[PDB]
């Protein structure tokens, strides 16, 4: 990690708006049991992370075409992980969509308000996409299985 810059430290961190932060107490405890994925934004006007949008039943694919092309968001996708004997259980993971293709003055901005819409949902799993296309179906049930591959 050695590729790049950096300077002062200090960015415009947001707060976790109040209507959302229950959207992820509820996510984590809904009354669901399939693929769900949650994509939250920062109003510059507030400077707080608010819902953006949320689908259901949907795989690791279709959310990367949910997802924008050069627009930093925050994105929370439930996947569903089996066992064996019979056990079933989703391992909530954090995707943190951050094109390279964006302006480093929006991407800054859920960049150091990420940790804070993390915190606030609890997830003690967050990855980070380099770009839409990484999400998929293997590039995400690898992170869960066990550790991604190099790097």
């Known amino acids: 990690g050695s590729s790049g810059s950096s300077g002062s430290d200090s960015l415009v ?3 976790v708006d ?6 992820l107490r509820k996510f984590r405890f809904r009354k669901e049991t399939n693929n769900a994925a949650i ?4 109003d510059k006007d507030r400077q707080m992370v608010v819902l953006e949008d949320e689908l259901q039943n949907i795989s690791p694919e279709e959310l990367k075409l949910e997802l924008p092309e050069r627009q930093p968001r925050f994105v929370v996708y439930s996947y569903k992980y089996v066992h064996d004997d019979g056990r079933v259980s989703y391992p909530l993971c954090f995707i943190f969509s951050s094109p390279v293709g964006c302006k480093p003055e929006q ?3 859920y960049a150091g308000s990420k940790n804070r819409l993390v915190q606030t949902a609890e997830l003690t799993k967050v990855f ?3 770009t839409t296309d990484d999400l998929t179906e293997t590039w995400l049930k690898e ?3 066990s550790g991604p591959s190099s790097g």
Not at 18 to 23: C, R
Not at 39 to 42: A, G, H, N, R
Request: include cysteine; proline fraction near 5%.
């Open 143 to 145: 992170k869960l299985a």
């Open 107 to 109: 991407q800054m901005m």
């Open 128 to 130: 980070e996409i380099r």
């Open 18 to 23: 109040p209507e959302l932060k229950e959207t």
């Open 39 to 42: 994509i939250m934004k920062v």
């Open 13 to 15: 961190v947001c707060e």
